[PDB]
Amino acid sequence: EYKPYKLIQQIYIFSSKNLYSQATKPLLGSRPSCNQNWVEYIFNGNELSQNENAFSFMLQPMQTFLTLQSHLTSSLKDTETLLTINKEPVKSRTEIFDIRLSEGLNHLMFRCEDKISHETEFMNFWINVLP
Amino acid sequence: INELERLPANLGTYSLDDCLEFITKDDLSSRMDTFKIKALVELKSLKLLT
Amino acid sequence: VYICHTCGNESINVRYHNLRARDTNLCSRCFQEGHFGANFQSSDFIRLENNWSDQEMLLLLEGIEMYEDQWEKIADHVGGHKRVEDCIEKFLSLPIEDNYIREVVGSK
Amino acid sequence: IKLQNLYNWTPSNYIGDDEIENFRNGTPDKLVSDSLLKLKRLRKERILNKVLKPTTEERELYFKVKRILKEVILAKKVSKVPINNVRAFPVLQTNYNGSIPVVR
Amino acid sequence: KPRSSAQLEQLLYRYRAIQNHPKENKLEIKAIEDTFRNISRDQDIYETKLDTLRKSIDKGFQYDEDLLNKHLVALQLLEKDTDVPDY
Amino acid sequence: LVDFLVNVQSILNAASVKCHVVDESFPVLTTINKRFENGEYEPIQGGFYKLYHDIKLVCTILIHFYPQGTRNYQLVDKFYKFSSELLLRECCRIGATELDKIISYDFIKISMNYTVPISQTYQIRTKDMDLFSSIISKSNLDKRPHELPNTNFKINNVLPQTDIENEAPRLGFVGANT
Amino acid sequence: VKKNWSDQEMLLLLEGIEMYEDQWEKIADHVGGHKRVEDCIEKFLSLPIEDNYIREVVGS
Numbered sequence: 001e002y003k004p005y006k007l008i009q010q011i012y013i014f015s016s017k018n019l020y021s022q023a024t025k026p027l028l029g030s031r032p033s034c035n036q037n038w039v040e041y042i043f044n045g046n047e048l049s050q051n052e053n054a055f056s057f058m059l060q061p062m063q064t065f066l067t068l069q070s071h072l073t074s075s076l077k078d079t080e081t082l083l084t085i086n087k088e089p090v091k092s093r094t095e096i097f098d099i100r101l102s103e104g105l106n107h108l109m110f111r112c113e114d115k116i117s118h119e120t121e122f123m124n125f126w127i128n129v130l131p
Numbered sequence: 132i133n134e135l136e137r138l139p140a141n142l143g144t145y146s147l148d149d150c151l152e153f154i155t156k157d158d159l160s161s162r163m164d165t166f167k168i169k170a171l172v173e174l175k176s177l178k179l180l181t
Numbered sequence: 182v183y184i185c186h187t188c189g190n191e192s193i194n195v196r197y198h199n200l201r202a203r204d205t206n207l208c209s210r211c212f213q214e215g216h217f218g219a220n221f222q223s224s225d226f227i228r229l230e231n232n233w234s235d236q237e238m239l240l241l242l243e244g245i246e247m248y249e250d251q252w253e254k255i256a257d258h259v260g261g262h263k264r265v266e267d268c269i270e271k272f273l274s275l276p277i278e279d280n281y282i283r284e285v286v287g288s289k
Numbered sequence: 290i291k292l293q294n295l296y297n298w299t300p301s302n303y304i305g306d307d308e309i310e311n312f313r314n315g316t317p318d319k320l321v322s323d324s325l326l327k328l329k330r331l332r333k334e335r336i337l338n339k340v341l342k343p344t345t346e347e348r349e350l351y352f353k354v355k356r357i358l359k360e361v362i363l364a365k366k367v368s369k370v371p372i373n374n375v376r377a378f379p380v381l382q383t384n385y386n387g388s389i390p391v392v393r
Numbered sequence: 394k395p396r397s398s399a400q401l402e403q404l405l406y407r408y409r410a411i412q413n414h415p416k417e418n419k420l421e422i423k424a425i426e427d428t429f430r431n432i433s434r435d436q437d438i439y440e441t442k443l444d445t446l447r448k449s450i451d452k453g454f455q456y457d458e459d460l461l462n463k464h465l466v467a468l469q470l471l472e473k474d475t476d477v478p479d480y
Numbered sequence: 481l482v483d484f485l486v487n488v489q490s491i492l493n494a495a496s497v498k499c500h501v502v503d504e505s506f507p508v509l510t511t512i513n514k515r516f517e518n519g520e521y522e523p524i525q526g527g528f529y530k531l532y533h534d535i536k537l538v539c540t541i542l543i544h545f546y547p548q549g550t551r552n553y554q555l556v557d558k559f560y561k562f563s564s565e566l567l568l569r570e571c572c573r574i575g576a577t578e579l580d581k582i583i584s585y586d587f588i589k590i591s592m593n594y595t596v597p598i599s600q601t602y603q604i605r606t607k608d609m610d611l612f613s614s615i616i617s618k619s620n621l622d623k624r625p626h627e628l629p630n631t632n633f634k635i636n637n638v639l640p641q642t643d644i645e646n647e648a649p650r651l652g653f654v655g656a657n658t
Numbered sequence: 659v660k661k662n663w664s665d666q667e668m669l670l671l672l673e674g675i676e677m678y679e680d681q682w683e684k685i686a687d688h689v690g691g692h693k694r695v696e697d698c699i700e701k702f703l704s705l706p707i708e709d710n711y712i713r714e715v716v717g718s
């Protein structure tokens with residue numbers, strides 16, 4: 001069972017630039033953050049294969065916002081793209097997103113389907129936010 | 132009590148006898164928590180003085 | 182035999198006693214995998230032998246901390262392979278203040 | 290003037306004259322024993338009228354004792370220096386933080 | 394003057410960050426320069442004295458065992474801030 | 481030099497008493513010990529690489545039987561994990577995103593890099609709960625495809641912790657008599 | 659030559675002391691990258707001493 005994705009190319013689940021901008025740059029002379037820790041989970045879609053389309057990782061309680069920058073380029077057509085954090089979809093802003101997690105264990109289902117020809121490609125995540 | 136209640140709670144011990152058990156990077160070495168127990172004993176025994 | 186508190190299976194040869202819920206034991210497999218609750222971390226679990234030493238001394242001090250006026254369960258906290266009266270004398274004869282007292286202070 | 294007069298500098302780089310006259314006239318134990326006595330006496334005078342953060346004089350004497358025993362063992366003056374190490378030392382550990390969410 | 398091998402490191406981080414724009418605080422640049430010029434004096438004296446201590450060394454004496462232990466153990470005990478009983 | 485090959489043989493023949501990997505025959509078949517007593521390994525890089533190639537070949541051959549969970553499979557895997565990380569560390573000592581832009585714009589990056597084999601896990605949603613399983617013990621030298629014992633399991637890929645340094649309580653949070 | 663010790667260096671120091679008892683040149687070679695006798699014995703006088711040994715020495 002090995003089928004590299006032919007629709008999605010790369011996905012970057014990194015830290016939201018808005019959270020960072022309020023962590024390194026104080027607001028009205030506020031005190032800096034106790035520490036800083038950022039992470040960019042890159043997933044090369046060409047190397048990864050479906051039937052193994054589930055991933056899991058953990059974040060600190062400080063990281064409660066993240067922006068799934070999708071990079072879908074192997075389609076070159078008009079293609080449906082949607083993701084559903086906790087089975088509720090979020091709208092887009094290449095395609096930049098913006099996700100607000102919760103204090104538990106939440107999964108976000110990224111989905112892309114071409115309209116010309118019916119090829120569907122899923123990608124799921126599980127982001128344990130630690131209390 | 133002050134000097135003992137500020138030690139790292141993840142304190143472990145690397146001993147010169149773990150070579151003979153061939154600990155791998157993905158297993159648990161025996162006698163890993165040796166100074167941790169020896170520190171908890173000296174701490175709880177100082178709290179249990181009265 | 183101690184039972185793990187997460188998978189519900191018997192411990193094999195060693196247990197991992199956490200020190201914030203002092204009645205909770207976790208087997209070895211569920212400590213590498215980190216299958217324990219997300220409230221704790223893997224920095225308060227002590228490795229203990231299932232089957233006087235630092236382990237038994239720590240368990241004695243934990244039994245005395247958990248229960249003050251009951252000396253029967255103290256033996257059931259260290260497993261129990263000796264008389265109920267060895268722990269009383271072992272606790273009374275600990276030289277824990279002598280190290281700090283020495284620092285300060287005919288008929289022929 | 291500077292720059293490799295600072296990279297090697299440690300706060301234990303003062304010899305004065307005592308260690309020179311002694312190590313020249315021999316008998317360095319007459320200096321280590323005397324300084325260990327001036328450490329114990331200045332420590333009993335520290336536990337009494339309780340204060341912490343050992344004074345600078347005690348730190349300087351501890352440096353002097355360290356430098357003397359180090360030079361003695363270095364020049365091969367002790368036959369089979371005693372080995373009494375614990376054969377273990379403290380090390381930190383990583384955190385396999387919990388993998389199942391808390392329920393409240 | 395610094396009294397640790399780590400305080401001088403920050404005294405140099407400070408001089409490294411202040412010297413970028415001179416003529417703003419001259420009494421901090423001059424002070425740090427004076428401190429460095431006294432530390433290079435101490436370090437040079439110790440450098441030229443550590444050889445005189447290994448040249449004027451004496452060969453007629455050999456430090457004895459069962460007395461070095463009574464000094465190594467007593468030094469480790471006195472450095473851990475624990476008492477050493479009167480011998 | 482040659483003083484290291486005898487130490488490697490003394491470590492392998494001391495850690496293979498339960499794995500039984502140096503007494504296995506591979507292509508006329510010869511074992512690993514029958515390569516030490518008669519010089520075929522050399523202090524040069526070719527000898528070290530020949531030894532690592534032989535250890536990997538024997539572990540690979542042994543892994544393809546002792547099918548999946550038998551102790552004879554996990555012990556050989558733990559031996560390959562010990563031997564590879566041993567020979568490596570001794571041969572070494574002998575011989576754009578939206579956030580990355582602002583970070584590289586405002587910070588200097590002293591980076592490091594390493595590669596860790598990923599591990600997998602089975603996971604499902606029974607009727608109302610999303611729950612996983614234990615870490616599958618399949619080796620990293622096995623090339624047999626997954627069987628999916630239920631034809632409804634989903635293969636989660638757990639990412640190793642990338643934070644080498646972490647914080648911990650001060651042993652006052654572990655204690656505090658009750 | 660560095661002047662700050664680490665965990666793999668205190669480890670190799672302990673191993674060198676266990677194997678070689680007074681040959682400081684061989685201990686320093688085992689921890690190659692540090693001073694021969696100015697840093698391999700300074701970190702020896704500061705190493706702890708076993709508790710049983712201290713008890714038996716101070717007692718007798």
Ligand SMILES: [Zn+2]
Binds near residue numbers: 186211
């Ligand atoms: Zn368990």
